[PDB]
């Protein structure tokens, strides 16, 4: 009574499982195809520090360009 329906169940279980394995492989392929925190806040802090340097430079009159 149970054998054909569990045969079908394991059949589409195999199908869905290795279909999902496939889909993981193309999602990693797309991740490669299109390719940190201390980094980005270091960039932001040097940007604000460079701005502060700019304002103090023309507040003190540091024009020595050529």
């Amino acid at each position: 009574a149970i054998k054909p329906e569990m045969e079908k169940r394991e059949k589409e279980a195999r199908r869905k499982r290795w279909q999902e394995i496939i889909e993981m492989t193309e999602r990693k392929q797309e991740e490669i195809r299109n390719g940190d925190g201390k980094w980005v806040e270091e960039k932001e802090v040097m940007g604000e520090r460079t701005r502060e340097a700019v304002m103090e430079a023309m507040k003190a009159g540091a024009w020595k360009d050529n």
């Binding site: 940190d36 925190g37 201390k38 980094w39 980005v40 806040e41 802090v45």
Partner: protein, 254 residues
């Protein structure tokens, strides 16, 4: 401290929103980003406007990337609201534009109505409405400072440089970032508007902020004298000591 309601508490009770949103709207006049902060608070009060259908997940992701901002999810939502307002001013259909950009027209209208109600309440209470210039580079920093002042309680810090798991200071909660976040690079401090507990602990609606900015926004909550465990509070105390040393150097040089 005695439980008595102050004028700020009375204003928060009069404003039909959360106490954190009311505090953010009150502190936005100091950050000079009152209109943007009111729009963000209205969008947070209204339901989620991002639509991600199963059959249109790629289109929804493309629309979110087009309307997203690198400063944070709150910045992305503000940019989406600004784009919707610009489309409405230009004369495009709001529902058609929301369907094309995977947005919710009803949620956008509710956010606009909540923003109008908040602006009316601010005009009744005498709260000034100011907005920083678009060409000014301090607009995003002012918006982040206003968001940190509004929601400094829900702030998370990364555990390590090699680990993406963040540690919210609220009872030392180990969580992650939600997949719907528009921030490609995680921040040192993430101010989270909503925390969702699931099989994977993730935090949604996260905006970038620094520990020094958070301590300047909320010195009482982030006090190093009353700071408990652990290393996140130690790093906050180290940042406060560095800021104090910088202030001492500036005072010596001035």
């Amino acid at each position: 401290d005695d439980g008595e309601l102050t004028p700020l508490g009375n204003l928060a009770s009069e404003f039909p929103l959360d106490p954190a949103l009311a505090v953010m709207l009150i502190s936005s006049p100091e950050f000079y980003c009152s209109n943007e902060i009111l729009s963000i608070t209205s969008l947070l009060s209204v339901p989620q406007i991002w639509v991600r259908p199963a059959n249109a997940r790629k289109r929804a992701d493309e629309m979110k990337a087009q309307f997203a901002h690198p400063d944070g999810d709150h910045l992305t939502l503000l940019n989406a609201y600004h784009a919707y307002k610009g489309a409405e001013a230009r004369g495009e259909d709001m529902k058609k534009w929301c369907h094309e950009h995977f947005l919710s027209y009803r949620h956008l209208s509710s956010a606009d109505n909540v923003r109008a109600q908040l602006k009316k309440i601010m005009e009744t209470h005498g709260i000034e409405l100011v907005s920083t210039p678009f060409h000014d580079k301090n607009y995003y920093t002012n918006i982040r400072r206003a968001l940190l002042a509004g929601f400094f309680m829900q702030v998370a810090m990364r555990e390590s440089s090699n680990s993406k798991v963040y540690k919210t200071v609220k009872d030392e909660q180990l969580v992650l970032i939600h997949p719907s976040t528009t921030v490609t690079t995680p921040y040192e401090w993430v101010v989270y508007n909503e925390f969702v507990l699931t099989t994977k602990q993730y935090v949604r609606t996260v905006t970038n902020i620094r520990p020094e900015w958070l301590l300047e926004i909320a010195p009482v909550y982030y006090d190093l004298s009353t700071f408990q465990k652990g290393e996140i509070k130690n790093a906050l105390t180290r940042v406060a000591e560095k800021i104090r040393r910088q202030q001492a150097m500036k005072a010596s040089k001035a």
